[PDB]
């Protein structure tokens, strides 16, 4: 029953993607995925994803998160794909059984919010998710509604949609 990925042609790409303007810290204020919202857990803590543009035009991507022990810094590379705003994972060989990792910036105004679509295939199991990014940790009802609406348009119902809890530890860095 795991929810199938939509066809990539149904996933918008941000027109005229500006990689310099997309840089820096985004708070992951919402997310939806085909796999789960788990189902035996308190609501998750917010993470930050930091996009640093390298000289070769790929992104160094740092996920900053809080766990009971400490702040974690998980780093990967987004290499440009065929169109501005599309990426694939540099370190794909480091993911056992992974044959594909695709990123598509669906929309953004650069200084406030973004939505990013992700898709992965690992031993022929397809996973996809959408993140709602904010330059601030709080966002308007307006944006939360757009995101919910977008998620549903990709076949993700409301019980697959999660709004992480803002924290100060780790992600204020
Ligand atoms: O196999 C995976 C899954 C995946 O490749 C992709 C995946 O399925 N992501 C699911 C994210 C669902 C949304 N979660 C809630 C929202 C907050 N998270 C994100 O926005 C987000 C977005 C993208 C990510 O890849 C990610 O990890 C998280 C991934 O990188 O997470 N991860 C483990 C990789 C192990 C690498 N070898 C061990 C070294 C230690 N790990 C890392 O350094 C590292 C670095 C960057 C990573 O993204 C990472 O997951 C691990
Ligand atoms: Ga990861």
From Swiss-Prot:
GO terms for biological process: acute-phase response; cellular response to amyloid-beta; cellular response to hydrogen peroxide; cellular response to hypoxia; cellular response to increased oxygen levels; cellular response to interleukin-1; cellular response to interleukin-6; cellular response to lipopolysaccharide. Detected in neutrophils (at protein level). Expressed in bone marrow and in tissues that are prone to exposure to microorganism. High expression is found in bone marrow as well as in uterus, prostate, salivary gland, stomach, appendix, colon, trachea and lung. Expressed in the medullary tubules of the kidney. Not found in the small intestine or peripheral blood leukocytes. The keyword Membrane does not apply. Glycans are attached at residue 60. Induction: Expression is activated by the oncoprotein BCR-ABL; BCR-ABL misregulates expression via the JAK/STAT pathway and binding of STAT5A to the promoter. Induced by insulin. Keywords: Apoptosis, Cytoplasmic vesicle, Disulfide bond, Glycoprotein, Immunity, Innate immunity, Ion transport, Iron, Iron transport, Pyrrolidone carboxylic acid, Secreted, Signal, Transport. A carboxymycobactin binds at residues 47-49, 120, 129, 133. PROSITE patterns: LIPOCALIN. Enterobactin binds at residues 101, 129. It is found in: Secreted; Cytoplasmic granule lumen; Cytoplasmic vesicle lumen. Its main location: secreted. GO terms for cellular component: extracellular exosome; extracellular region; extracellular space; specific granule lumen. One of its GO terms (molecular function) is iron ion binding. It comes from the Eukaryota. InterPro entries: Calycin (IPR012674), LCN2/LCN12 (IPR003087), Lipocalin (IPR002345), Lipocalin_CS (IPR022272), Lipocln_cytosolic_FA-bd_dom (IPR000566). Monomer. Homodimer; disulfide-linked. Heterodimer; disulfide-linked with MMP9. PANTHER family: LIPOCALIN, NEUTROPHIL GELATINASE-ASSOCIATED LIPOCALIN. Belongs to the calycin superfamily. Lipocalin family. Iron-trafficking protein involved in multiple processes such as apoptosis, innate immunity and renal development. Binds iron through association with 2,3-dihydroxybenzoic acid (2,3-DHBA), a siderophore that shares structural similarities with bacterial enterobactin, and delivers or removes iron from the cell, depending on the context. Iron-bound form (holo-24p3) is internalized following binding to the SLC22A17 (24p3R) receptor, leading to release of iron and subsequent increase of intracellular iron concentration. This is Neutrophil gelatinase-associated lipocalin. It comes from Homo sapiens (Human). The lineage of its organism: Eukaryota, Metazoa, Chordata, Craniata, Vertebrata.
């Amino acid at each position: 029953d795991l929810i199938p990925a939509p066809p990539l042609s149904k996933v918008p790409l941000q027109q005229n993607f500006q990689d310099n303007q997309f840089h820096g810290k985004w708070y992951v204020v919402g997310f939806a995925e085909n796999i789960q919202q788990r189902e035996d857990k308190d609501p998750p803590k917010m993470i930050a994803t930091i996009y640093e543009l390298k000289e070769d035009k790929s992104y160094n991507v740092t996920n900053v998160a809080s766990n009971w022990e400490k702040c974690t810094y998980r780093i990967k590379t987004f290499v440009p794909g065929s169109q501005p705003g599309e990426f694939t994972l540099g370190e794909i060989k480091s993911r056992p059984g992974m044959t594909s990792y695709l990123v598509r910036v669906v929309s953004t105004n650069y200084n406030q919010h973004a939505m990013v679509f992700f898709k992965t295939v690992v031993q022929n199991r397809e996973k996809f998710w959408i993140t709602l990014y904010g330059r601030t940790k709080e966002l308007t009802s307006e944006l939360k509604e757009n995101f919910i609406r977008f998620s549903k348009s990709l076949g993700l119902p409301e019980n697959h949609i999660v709004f992480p809890v803002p924290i100060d530890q780790c992600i204020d860095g």
